[PDB]
Each structure stands twice: as C-alpha cells, then as structure tokens.
Design a protein around this ligand. Structure first.
Ligand code: 7SI
Ligand code: CL
Ligand code: MN
Ligand code: ZN
Ligand code: ZN
Length: 453
C-alpha cells in the first residue's frame, strides 16, 4: 500500500585485518555484492578520520532541483556551508513541523515517493555537487598547512578516497590522458529530499561513496545483470530520455519509484547510509536515492582488474548506441603495456589477456577494410589529438588503434566499423591511419607475459 520498501542490501563489517587492503576486500565480497548491485561497508570502530572545516569560508554555487517522477533532468547564486545548513534545516523543520532529528527515516522515504508522484506538489530543493578545488576541498586529509599527528595517520589510507585512483591494484593510475571527471573525487552537500536520479557510472566503472557527517542518505540499487531489463522498463514509461543526446554533458536521467521496477520483475535493494559508512556500487549497477537532511559526502570512480573485460564490452555498447566515450580503452591498455616493467604482476597478467583480444579484433578489422579497397596507409599518433578531433563521424567512438581518412573531407575520421560513412569518394582515395603495426604490438604483449612470469 503506497510504498513497499525493497529488501536491504548486504552490510559488511570487516576486521582491521580485512579492512587494511581495500582492493583485496572488494574482491572478496564481490560474489555476494554483485548480486545486489550496491552494498554497505562499516569500517572498524577506531578507524575515524578527522573532519575539520570552517563553515563560513567554504562557499559553493547551488544547483536547483524539481521533484517530479519521470521528468527529465540533466546530469552535471551562492552559499557558505553555514548559510546552506541554515536553509536546509529550516526547510525540513518547516516541512514536517518537527525538530529535524525526530523525523523518522521511514517517514521521509514514504513522503519522498508521495511528493514526486503527486502532480500538484511543486516542491523544489537545492544541493551542491563539484570536484575538489581551492574554494572547496576534500573532506579527507591531503598534503599542503601543517597537519596534526592524527591527520597524518589517514593521509595514506587506502580508504582515503584521494588515494584510491592512484594505487596499483587499480588500472586507471598509470594513465596520463587526464580524464578528470574520473580520477578526482566529487563532493556532495545534501538537504532533505535532494536526489540523485537513476544512472550507471561512465564506462561501467565501480564507485565508492563516503558520508563524512550529517543525516543519512537513502540508496536504491540494481545488480549489473539486470541493467537491460531496467532500461526496457524505462523506455516504455519515459522514451524522451532515450532520444540521442548531442554531447556527454547532455545525458538525460530521471526519478522513478523502485516499486514500479519491482512490479516488472527487476530486482531492487535499499539501504540507509549513515555518517562514517561507505557505499560501493559495482559495474553496470543502476542506482539512485535521496538525502534525509543536511549532510556532506564524497565519492570517486575506480577500476580494478576484474572490470577490464566489462570496460571493453562497455565501449562496444557505446558504439552500438552512438554514445560518446570519456577516454579510449585501447589507449589505456597500450599505455599500461608500455609501462609493463613497473606494473603489479596480477595487473600485468589481466592486461595481457585483454590485449590479446584487442589485437585479434584489430587484425580482422584491417583485413576487412583492405578487402574494401583501402590500400594506402600511414602511422598516426592518435593520443596527441584532442578527443573531439578523433571521434568516428558515425558512431562517435574515440579512435586510437586505427581510423580511415580522406583528402576530400579534411580532419574527419571514421572507425573501421564505419568505412562506408566517411564520404562518397571511391575507396582508393582513402587512407588507413594506424597507431601500431601488428609487429609493434606482439612485443608489447610479450613484455606483459614476462612481467607476469
Ligand atoms: O529477486 C528479487 C530481489 C529483490 C527484489 O526487490 C525483487 C526480487 C523479485 C523481482 C522484483 C522483486 C521481487
Ligand atoms: Cl511533484
Ligand atoms: Mn553514481
Ligand atoms: Zn564508428
Ligand atoms: Zn572523399
């Protein structure tokens, strides 16, 4: 009746021993947590990073949000942290005519789903979302200011979210392409009912979220295996979200009742994340939620060796949908192979397996365009080109291994799947532009094999 809360997602309480290495722990819980999409992690009781900030000197620009189910919103005036906190507390307090910490969490959840479904409520809220900067920085300790002995303790923690991208069990790391939205932590200031719509991470990566302080955050999550099942339910009830988006900054997303999904046999899980807890989302796991009140959270994307195959399948899927990429997956693979001597040995072994698939697909593709009559060729350093200067005119994929050009249409490229879409000239006028010959590639893969012994 009205709202039936989904079943709870798994909650983990690792010992200090298990907690020490984040990457080993995530790998251990993976068979459980990948069945539910999200999961929650309670750190050992004495792991408590200091949070310190001046509420008057931190300022940020707020986003405004309307709260209607199935209405399109796009992914990605001034407040100090204090003035925002005052606005947010007054708002919740007046909405319920109660002291903000006496409003039960079950009630806010029930009320959230009522107000987004009711056509005649026009409730709007405000929130903060931004990567770290000079005006507003990480809530975790970072180097700069003289630090206290306890701040120093957490500087090199694996669960300090600043460190997590640049550790060596992670495969974004040795990458230099500066895909900034994905190596840097985002900061989120919440108030009651402020919401994050249904979505998955760029390139189907993991994410990890830490709530520093304040009232809880409520999550809904769907396992990766049910991603297409959820998208079919979404297309049927709100097709406007699926019209082709011009850019990467034009992704359309929405609020949708998890009960609607469960009615159509999509598995949904929930949790309340409290201050000092982590939530982790797994590859291709849809998630959404809202805040119970005034709070402060920090989040980061990351990629493990487990993810490498999915990362390839994802870029393939982007091509079918003509979606833009954040980075080139093959460029990342080749960059790791060129640094094979300093890679973790398990990393090296997993990269090698992906590289073997890459090379075999590339061989087949070059044979196919040769038989279409493209004969001329020249080496080309794709990584020097700005990304928007090396997308396939048809499918918008970011080229790195190879592309086709023509003197007729200067500066345009197509990937090798779309040779017929460049122009109307005969194929002998075309040129195959390539980063590596097959003979360059096999020694790069052999270096990985040696490093992996
Ligand atoms: O196996 C699960 C797991 C979670 C969940 O919320 C649901 C199911 C069935 C499918 C939707 C409802 C019933
Ligand atoms: Cl509404
Ligand atoms: Mn997310
Ligand atoms: Zn293409
Ligand atoms: Zn031409």
């Amino acid at each position: 009746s009205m709202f039936l809360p989904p079943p709870e997602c798994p909650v983990f309480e690792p010992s200090w021993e298990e907690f020490a290495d984040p990457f080993a722990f995530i790998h251990k819980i993976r068979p459980i947590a990948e069945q539910t999409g999200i999961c929650k992690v309670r750190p050992p009781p004495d792991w408590q990073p200091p949070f310190a900030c001046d509420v008057d000197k931190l300022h940020f620009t707020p986003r405004i949000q309307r709260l209607n189910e199935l209405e399109a919103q796009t992914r990605v005036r001034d407040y100090t942290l204090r003035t925002f906190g005052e606005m947010a507390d007054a708002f919740k307090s007046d909405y319920f005519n109660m002291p903000v910490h006496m409003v039960p969490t079950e009630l806010v959840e029930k009320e959230f789903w009522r107000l987004v479904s009711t056509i005649e409520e026009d409730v709007t809220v405000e929130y903060g979302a931004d990567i770290a900067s000079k005006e507003f920085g990480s809530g975790f300790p970072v180097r700069d200011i003289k630090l206290s002995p306890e701040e120093e303790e957490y500087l090199d923690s694996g669960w300090n979210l600043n460190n997590m991208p640049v550790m060596e069990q992670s495969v974004l790391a040795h990458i230099t392409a500066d895909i900034c939205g994905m190596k840097l932590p985002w900061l989120y200031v919440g108030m009651c009912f402020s919401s994050f719509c249904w979505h998955i991470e760029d390139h189907w990566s993991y994410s990890i979220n830490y709530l520093h302080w304040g009232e809880p955050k409520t999550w809904y999550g769907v396992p990766g295996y049910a991603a297409e099942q959820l998208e079919n339910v979404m297309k049927k009830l709100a097709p406007e979200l699926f019209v082709s988006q011009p850019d990467l900054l034009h992704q359309l997303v929405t609020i949708m009742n998890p009960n609607t999904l469960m009615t159509h046999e999509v598995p949904v899980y929930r949790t309340n994340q409290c201050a000092g807890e982590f939530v982790i989302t797994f590859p291709r796991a849809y998630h959404s939620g809202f805040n119970q009140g005034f709070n402060f959270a920090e989040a980061v994307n990351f990629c493990t060796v487990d993810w490498l195959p999915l990362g390839r399948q994802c870029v393939e899927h982007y091509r079918l949908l003509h979606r833009y990429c954040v980075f080139s997956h093959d460029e990342m693979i080749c960059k790791m192979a060129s640094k094979a001597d300093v890679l973790d040995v398990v990393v090296a072994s997993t990269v090698q397996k992906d590289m073997a698939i890459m090379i075999e697909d590339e061989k087949a593709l070059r044979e196919t365009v040769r038989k279409l009559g493209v004969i001329d060729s020249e080496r080309m350093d794709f990584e020097l080109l700005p990304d928007d200067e090396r997308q396939c005119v048809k499918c918008k994929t970011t080229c790195f291994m190879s592309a086709i050009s023509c003197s007729c249409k200067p500066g345009l490229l197509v990937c090798l799947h779309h040779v017929k879409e460049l122009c109307s000239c005969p194929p002998y006028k075309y040129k195959l532009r390539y980063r590596y010959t097959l003979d360059d590639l096999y020694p790069m893969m052999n270096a990985l094999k040696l490093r992996a012994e």
